Design a binder for these strands. Structure first.
Ligand SMILES: O=C(O)c1ccc(O)c2ncccc12
Ligand SMILES: [Cl-]
Ligand SMILES: [Fe+2]
Ligand SMILES: [Zn+2]
Ligand SMILES: [Zn+2]
Ligand SMILES: [Zn+2]
Length: 404
DNA sequence: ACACACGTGTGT
DNA sequence: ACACACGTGTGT
């Protein structure tokens, strides 16, 4: 809508936009209700060159880490090359460090782990594997490997609408076999969490939130949540799951995704040094040489303090399946040397904390999560709860009338 | 173009 | 217990 192509990155404003970085701080200070050090903004640069290992699997090159307990809100922004207009700078990620009560995050971790390991039905996804479909990033033990579990409503190409188009009584929280008591406990946890996160979503990304509630009263059966204001329709739980680089292509246009992170008990204090850790990665971005306010020295101090961790290349042994998964293993050397030799190969990661809430337009931005050293969904290093709304979920009763 | 998706119910 | 049926956009 200005008079200033793919190489500048995807253009959208429903998370926030302004003429310069200072304007983004003004927006976020008003939205969040606090000023100054409570809000941190990082400039990130779109390169379009994807960081990945020699086997095609996700890597991080820089890690944005919470700088102190005084930092409450992290915002990643992209300045669009060449633009001087009202939307020259756009917001691509919002992270609330203190998202949900820690006692609730503690309880969800244990309850969801136990329920999903004794009754969970695995939901298969394309991003579970690399391009060649031969990696072992989830682990190779079927009893313990990382896995994804999907609930709520989902879009289906066979009905061009909700997958429950001809389900007399849909089970949004289906578990293995039939146990209504266990499914109701799981449903109660995730419905309560949907209800809690909706006001945070409205507060911090109001334009994306408002888009997601436009047809709430037209398709109530395809929405989660217990109170007025229901932006979500589906939720996926990921337990030690390595999401290879992808976009969520059938998410609705002009919406976003909210991610609630839960972590193992050894990674729940700010001063901690956990044994393992999973990161959320934007593979097409690099970090800036200046901080939010344009200072070179400020950015260097954040690198020395760990607030921005500059990683170096690795060479590790991994497994490679002898035959690809359709649609035995061997030990091979996997390295990231070439991704680190090129300064313009991307890989900006964030380290979300226990109980944090992350907001990003997963439909437009390429993203990934890193593989765990020893995945174990029975005692996961990280659980992510991923809340979204698919496209074409706007018909009553899961679109039963259209299907007829 | 063109292989590829956070599936379910009915049929045989 | 499989077997069939139902057929959408995006990235490349
Ligand atoms: O951060 C995660 O754990 C995550 C995992 C798998 C996904 O498909 C995601 N999609 C959008 C945002 C986050 C995620
Ligand atoms: Cl999204
Ligand atoms: Fe995703
Ligand atoms: Zn992999
Ligand atoms: Zn412009
Ligand atoms: Zn539905």
């Amino acid at each position: 809508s200005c008079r200033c192509e793919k190489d500048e990155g995807p253009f959208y404003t429903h998370l926030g936009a302004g003429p310069n970085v200072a304007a983004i701080r003004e927006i976020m200070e008003e939205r969040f209700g606090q000023k100054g050090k409570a809000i941190r903004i990082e400039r990130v640069i779109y390169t379009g060159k994807e960081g990945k290992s020699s086997q095609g699997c996700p890597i991080a090159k820089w890690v944005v880490r919470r700088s102190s307990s005084e930092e409450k809100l992290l915002c990643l922004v992209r300045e669009r090359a060449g633009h001087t207009c009202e939307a020259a700078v756009i917001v691509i990620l919002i992270l609330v460090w203190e998202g949900i009560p820690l006692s609730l995050a503690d309880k969800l971790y244990s309850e969801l782990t136990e329920t999903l390991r004794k009754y969970g039905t695995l939901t298969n996804r394309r991003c579970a594997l690399n391009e060649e479909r031969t990696c072992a990033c989830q682990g190779l033990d079927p009893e313990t490997c990382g896995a994804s579990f999907s609930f709520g409503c989902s879009w289906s190409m066979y009905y061009n609408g909700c997958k429950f188009a001809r389900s007399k009584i849909p089970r949004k929280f289906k578990l293995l076999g039939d146990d209504p008591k266990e499914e109701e406990k799981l449903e109660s946890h995730l419905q309560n969490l949907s209800t809690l996160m909706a006001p945070t979503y409205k507060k911090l990304a109001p334009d994306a939130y408002n888009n997601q509630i436009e047809y709430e009263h037209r398709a109530p059966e395809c929405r989660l949540g217990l109170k007025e204001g229901r932006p979500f329709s589906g939720v996926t739980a990921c337990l030690d799951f390595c999401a290879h680089a992808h976009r969520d292509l059938h998410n609705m246009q002009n919406g976003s995704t909210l991610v609630c992170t839960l972590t193992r008990e050894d990674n729940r204090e700010f001063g901690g040094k956990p044994e393992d850790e999973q990161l959320h990665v934007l593979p097409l971005y690099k970090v800036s040489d200046v901080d939010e306010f344009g200072s070179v020295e400020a950015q260097e101090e954040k690198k020395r303090s760990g607030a921005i961790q500059v990683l170096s290349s690795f060479r590790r042994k991994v497994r490679m399946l002898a035959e690809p998964v359709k649609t035995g293993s061997d030990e091979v050397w996997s390295d990231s040397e070439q991704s680190f030799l090129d300064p313009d190969i991307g890989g900006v990661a964030v380290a979300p904390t226990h109980g944090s809430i992350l907001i990003e337009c997963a439909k437009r931005e390429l993203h990934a999560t890193t593989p765990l050293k020893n995945p174990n969904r029975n005692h996961p290093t990280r659980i992510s709860l991923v809340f979204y709304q698919h496209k074409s979920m706007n018909e009553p009763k899961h679109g039963l009338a259209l299907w007829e």
